[PDB]
Structure formats: C-alpha cells, structure tokens
Paper text:
The zinc-dependent metalloprotease meprin α is predominantly expressed in the brush border membrane of proximal tubules in the kidney and enterocytes in the small intestine and colon. In normal tissue homeostasis meprin α performs key roles in inflammation, immunity, and extracellular matrix remodelling. In contrast to meprin β, meprin α is secreted into the extracellular space, whereupon it oligomerises to form giant assemblies and is the largest extracellular protease identified to date (~6 MDa). Here, using cryo-electron microscopy, we determine the high-resolution structure of the zymogen and mature form of meprin α, as well as the structure of the active form in complex with a prototype small molecule inhibitor and human fetuin-B. Our data reveal that meprin α forms a giant, flexible, left-handed helical assembly of roughly 22 nm in diameter.
Activation of the zymogen was accomplished by way of magnetic trypsin beads. These enabled the cleavage of the pro-peptide and facilitated subsequent removal of trypsin without further dilution of the protein sample by additional purification steps. Comparison between the cryo-EM reconstructions of the latent and activated states reveal subtle conformational changes about the M12A catalytic domain. Accordingly, the steric occlusion of the active site represents the major autoinhibitory mechanism. Upon activation, the two lobes of the M12A catalytic domain collapse around the active site (RMSD 3.3 Å), permitting the formation of a more tightly folded active site core. Upon proteolytic cleavage of the pro-peptide the active is exposed and the M12A protease domain undergoes a conformational relaxation. The exposed active site defines a deep pocket that positions the catalytic glutamic acid in close proximity to the substrate peptide as described for meprin β56. The subunit is a compact triad comprising the globular M12A protease, MAM and MATH domains. The meprin α M12A domain is typical, containing the catalytic zinc ion within the active site. For all variants, the zymogen form was roughly 6 kDa higher in mass than the activated counterpart consistent with the removal of the propeptide.
Residue numbers in the entry: 66 to 600
The structure:
Amino acid sequence: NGLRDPNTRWTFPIPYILADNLGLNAKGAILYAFEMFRLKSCVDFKPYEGESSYIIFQQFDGCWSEVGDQHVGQNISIGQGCAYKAIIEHEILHALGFYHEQSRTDRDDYVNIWWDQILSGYQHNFDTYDDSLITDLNTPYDYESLMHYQPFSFNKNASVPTITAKIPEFNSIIGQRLDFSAIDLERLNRMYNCTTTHTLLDHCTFEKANICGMIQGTRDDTDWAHQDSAQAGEVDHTLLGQCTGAGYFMQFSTSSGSAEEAALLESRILYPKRKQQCLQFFYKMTGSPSDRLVVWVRRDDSTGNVRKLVKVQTFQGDDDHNWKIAHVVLKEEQKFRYLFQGTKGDPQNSTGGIYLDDITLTETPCPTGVWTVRNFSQVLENTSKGDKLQSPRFYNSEGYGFGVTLYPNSRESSGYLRLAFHVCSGENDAILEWPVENRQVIITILDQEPDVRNRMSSSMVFTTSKSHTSPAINDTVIWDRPSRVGTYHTDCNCFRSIDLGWSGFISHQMLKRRSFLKNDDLIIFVDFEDITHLS
Ligand SMILES: *[C@@H]1O[C@H](CO[C@@H]2O[C@@H](C)[C@@H](O)[C@@H](O)[C@@H]2O)[C@@H](O[C@@H]2O[C@H](CO)[C@@H](O[C@@H]3O[C@H](CO)[C@@H](O)[C@H](O)[C@@H]3O)[C@H](O)[C@H]2NC(C)=O)[C@H](O)[C@H]1NC(C)=O
Ligand SMILES: *[C@@H]1O[C@H](CO)[C@@H](O[C@@H]2O[C@H](CO)[C@@H](O[C@@H]3O[C@H](CO)[C@@H](O)[C@H](O)[C@@H]3O)[C@H](O)[C@H]2NC(C)=O)[C@H](O)[C@H]1NC(C)=O
Ligand SMILES: *[C@@H]1O[C@H](CO)[C@@H](O[C@@H]2O[C@H](CO)[C@@H](O[C@@H]3O[C@H](CO)[C@@H](O)[C@H](O)[C@@H]3O)[C@H](O)[C@H]2NC(C)=O)[C@H](O)[C@H]1NC(C)=O
Ligand SMILES: *[C@@H]1O[C@H](CO)[C@@H](O[C@@H]2O[C@H](CO)[C@@H](O)[C@H](O)[C@H]2NC(C)=O)[C@H](O)[C@H]1NC(C)=O
Ligand SMILES: *[C@@H]1O[C@H](CO)[C@@H](O[C@@H]2O[C@H](CO)[C@@H](O)[C@H](O)[C@H]2NC(C)=O)[C@H](O)[C@H]1NC(C)=O
Ligand SMILES: *[C@@H]1O[C@H](CO)[C@@H](O)[C@H](O)[C@H]1NC(C)=O
Ligand SMILES: [Ca+2]
Ligand SMILES: [Ca+2]
Ligand SMILES: [Zn+2]
C-alpha cells in the first residue's frame, strides 16, 4: 500500500504547524502521536520555522490527509471525535505515503467490497491501485493493519457490512484501532530506511546466555543466578512456562548466608539522547519482608569514566508472591549504567528470593499511575453487569489526586469493559485551582511485551473541560473540588468525583488476544497532565 514514486518521500524531521482551530485536546493528542512514532520508528517531526514542504494540522469536517509529500505543504484534518492515538497515526501514515490496506492490488484475494452498501462520496476509500502507483514493500496482506477498514465502515444500513474477509474468522479481527501492526512498522521501516528508533534506549528478557550484555560487580558479596524455569512453580515472566527449557529470569536467593549480603547486576553503558528516561521491569520478592531490591545509576563523573553512583528507588516484599511491575524515573544527561542491588534480610526467615525479567528503558516520562487487577479472567466471570472495581488513588506532578473505575461487564454495551477516570480528594486540594480545566487524561491498557515495537497497547485520550457537567450534581462541572461534587468511600477515605470515560473501551474478545491478560492479570496505565501551554 506504499506510494512508489520516490519524489513523494519526506526528509526527516517533518516540519509541522498545529493550527488554532484545533482544540487543546487535539494538539495534545497529535503531540502524543508524534511520541509514538519516535518510540517505534525513526520518523521525526519539528516546529515549522519556514520550510518548503510541511504538514499543517487543522479541524475540518472528518478525518483525512493527502498521500505522500506535496511539495507546496499540505493539510491533515482531525474533526470531532478524531482525537485518538490510532486515528492520528492513520492520517500521519497517509501523509508518510500509505493508502488503506484494502486498496492493495491483491486485495480481492483477501476481502470482499460490497459496493452498493457504501454511502455516497466515500467510495474512493475502497479503490484499489495498480502496481505502477503502489508497492507491497514485499509484505503480505495484513488483516491486523492499522490501515484496514472495519466491516461497518460508511455503510448505508447498520446491520449489513461494507467490507468482509473471505476467510470468515478475520471479520472479528479487521479494523483494529489499537496501534501499528508489526507489518505496518516493517513497511514503514522498509520505506524510510529506519534501522533504529529515537526513544527505545535498552530492553532485556534474559533469554540469551549473554544476559543482554549485563555484567556482575565484584565489590558486592555474591552473584545473581541466570535461572532456567525448569524447577516446579519457578516459571519465567517472558513465557510463563509455555516453552520447555527456554524461559529465563535473573534470581537472587535470600534463604541462606548472612543478613545484609548483596549482589549487583549492572547494565552495559548507555548514551541518552534526552534529559529523562523511564525504566520498566517485572519482579518478585518471595523471600523475607526485610529483603530489598534497590535500583541505582552509575554515571560519567565528567572525566569520561563511568564511576559516580546515585540511588534512585527501593522495593520490598509484601504478602503477594506473584509477578509485579515496577517503573523508575531516571534523569541522566550523560552516559550511564542502570544497576540492581538484591539484598538479604533475615535469611533464617526466608524460603525464597528476588526475581527479575522483562526490563525496558525508554527516553519518555513514566506513567503517573499504574493499576494491576489480579485474576482478571475470573473477575470477568464472577462480576454482575454494573458492578465495579476502583483503583487506589494516584497523584500528579502538580499534586491533583486521581483514580480509575473499571466495570468489567459494561451494562451500557454487552461484551465490553467500561473504563473511566475520576478525580480524588487528596492532601493538596486546598492550594490547587478548581475546576481542573485543561489537563489531558491518557488511559492505556498495556500489551505486555518487552520490546516496545511489539506492543499494541489500547489507549484513549480526553481533556477535562468546563463543558463536562452532570444532572446528578445540579448541572455543575464534574471536575470541581471532590469534597463538594464527589461521594465518600471507606476504601481510601477519599471523595471520588463522578467518573467520565468509555463504555466500549475494549471488547472481551480483544482482551483475550495478544498480551493484555498475560498472567491472567490486567495492567492499566494512567497519565493526567496540564496541556494549557499549547494554547
Ligand atoms: C518472618 O516471616 C513471617 C512470614 O513471612 C512469610 O513466610 C516467609 C517464609 C516468606 O515466604 C515471606 O515472604 C512470607 O510473607 C513474617 O510474617 C509477616 O509479618 C508481617 C508483619 O507483621 C505481616 O504483614 C501484616 O499483615 C497484616 C494482615 O495479615 C496487616 O494488617 C499488617 O499491616 C501487615 O501488613 C505478614 O502478613 C506476615 N506474613 C505471614 C504470611 O505470616 C514475620 O514478620 C517475619 N518475622 C521476622 C522476624 O522478620
Ligand atoms: C488547507 O485547506 C484550506 C481549505 O481548503 C486551504 O485554504 C484555501 O485556499 C484556497 C486557495 O487559496 C482558497 O481558494 C480560493 O478562495 C477564494 C475565496 O476565499 C477564491 O476567490 C479563490 O478563487 C480560490 O477559490 C480557499 O478558499 C481556502 N479556504 C479557506 C477556508 O481558507 C489551505 O490552502 C490548505 N492548506 C494547505 C497548505 O494545503
Ligand atoms: C532508502 O534507501 C534506498 C537504498 O539506498 C534508497 O534508494 C536509492 O536512492 C538513490 C537516490 O538517493 C538512488 O540513486 C538514484 O538512482 C536513479 C536511478 O534509479 C538515478 O537516476 C539517480 O541519479 C540516482 O543515482 C538509488 O538507485 C536508490 N536505490 C534503490 C535500491 O532504490 C532510498 O532513496 C532511501 N530512501 C530514503 C531517502 O528514505
Ligand atoms: C438493513 O438490513 C437488515 C438485514 O438485511 C434488513 O432487515 C431485514 O429486512 C427484510 C425485508 O424487510 C426482512 O424480511 C428481514 O426479516 C429483516 N431482517 C432483520 C434482521 O430485521 C433491513 O430491512 C435493512 N434496512 C434497510 C435500511 O433497508
Ligand atoms: C487467583 O486464583 C487462583 C486460583 O484459584 C488462586 O490460587 C489459589 O489460591 C488459594 C488460596 O491462596 C490456594 O489455596 C490455591 O492452592 C491456589 N491455587 C493455585 C492454582 O495457585 C490465587 O490466589 C488467586 N489470586 C488472587 C489474588 O485472588
Ligand atoms: C441540588 O439542589 C437540591 C435542591 O435545591 C439540593 O437539595 C441539593 O443539596 C443540591 N445539591 C448540590 C450539588 O448543591
Ligand atoms: Ca557479584
Ligand atoms: Ca525471561
Ligand atoms: Zn485512511
């Protein structure tokens, strides 16, 4: 589906204008989509500064783009309801040079188009092009492609589909609005010569005996064991016992020796391109409650030698023995190495140890709040329609309190989750401005893969607004101070606002695909941050 003529190719970074007929929500959503491109490809974007061809993003009727670089500068429309990651990425892929997936020359081998069902004026989105105009980039037809239409697209009748897969199973798969497919990234890389990406700095799964180039220190007392996943119940996080003799984690036993013994596992040297990074990993602590996992940085002391230590975070064992996710913010502006110190406490009271797998390091912020729901595949069966779960309270950088509500069986839409955001009372409320006004919420359901290029995390975006009001609170703003417009909960001593979000956030069948439920538990990320400065 890529335009063949090389004079249609951009030279990076692509200069952009965000126009003031966009709302703040749309500007923030576009900048969030540019971060996803920089994180999964070598595509890059810059503010305009006066250049020959450029993309101007505007609000007109519907979502659309011209295809490929137009040398006089071009327009990308993001209308009402278009301001979602997957939709912005679809229009930017048009500007980069891609037509819809159903427009491939071979498409009649894979899908049926029902022409008399298409609403007038939209039919060109179902055209197919000759191989003189379009390349396949030597890739097969991808039903999972972000560039493929859903069955009920531009249909005259709500019951009859416009496009259907010839093999009938894929009717449930085509038209996904998660993220780029693997084949979409391969096509993008083949078109633009991307061998790397601007923002994935390191990742590790411990699956090769090289342990991702990690080294073990000798100023410590002991070593981490590279561990085989063969022993009963000792499964690795990357594969959870799926493949025999082939899943690997790092282990530090705490059941023997002296208290306060330690082991250092230390990364290879890294060269950061930005001022901030996020280190994500999975761990367990089945040992003593006094065992510790500590994360450290070792960095250039400005002589060019990596020696200076900084302690960044500490983790400890609660009563939960299943795998946990962790995020650590790093602020490294010179070359460095990230380090794990495992430490024993009370070895005569430990029958276990510390475990590590699935490290990822990105030159991004960390998620502001993270919620894990355990046994979700069982929660989904044991919960009536309109029953709910609620997250613990999180806090912004700005100090606002917030949380999320999950209704596992949406009474508003059967066969979907309903996931929604609320503002919580917190210790800061007296000094914060109310209503919260132009703060953008991003909710993400993590696709649990260690390489970010394999992740199709579902995500939704909205901006808190003075127009968000409810009859339940005498038609006042939902985002006013939670002590006057929320309801008290004994679960955290919080007042929680009325919630706003999506019935139909994700379907139960989509949630059982990919790695959304990897260990039969569900990981939701949330961010809540000011975007007023984009005005
Ligand atoms: C010695 O170890 C015990 C038990 O620890 C358990 O068994 C070990 C072999 C390991 O497998 C451990 O991972 C495992 O937890 C310690 O008992 C623990 O003590 C803490 C503190 O009292 C308990 O936490 C409390 O839990 C209650 C609710 O039950 C809360 O209300 C409290 O606020 C607090 O969180 C923990 O439940 C308890 N664990 C168990 C399963 O008994 C013991 O303290 C430890 N002693 C020493 C000297 O370190
Ligand atoms: C992005 O889209 C907008 C809207 O399509 C483009 O602005 C448009 O520019 C054209 C060409 O100048 C305008 O056409 C002219 O309109 C005047 C009357 O306004 C008429 O006298 C001329 O004969 C001609 O038809 C068009 O009206 C104008 N639309 C608006 C609303 O301003 C814009 O150029 C596009 N930008 C890029 C870089 O693609
Ligand atoms: C991505 O990498 C490929 C492979 O290096 C680039 O394709 C190559 O592009 C150059 C021009 O930069 C081509 O050279 C030109 O060839 C034409 C005749 O085909 C000639 O008329 C020109 O004077 C010039 O010599 C080269 O042939 C071409 N090779 C292939 C395999 O197509 C491609 O441009 C890169 N794309 C980018 C910039 O992302
Ligand atoms: C939209 O499509 C549905 C399904 O084809 C149509 O409903 C059928 O209409 C025929 C003729 O009236 C009935 O014999 C069937 O029993 C109907 N089936 C269902 C599922 O109701 C519907 O009429 C179409 N609507 C439009 C706008 O033509
Ligand atoms: C999720 O469900 C599993 C399976 O029911 C729970 O694991 C069992 O937990 C009970 C009570 O601790 C034990 O007696 C069983 O032996 C466990 N079975 C297995 C397969 O391990 C698990 O505890 C549940 N987790 C949560 C957090 O609810
Ligand atoms: C809304 O109005 C009713 C009737 O005046 C009153 O009883 C109730 O307390 C009001 N609630 C709020 C949110 O002020
Ligand atoms: Ca050592
Ligand atoms: Ca592993
Ligand atoms: Zn499109």
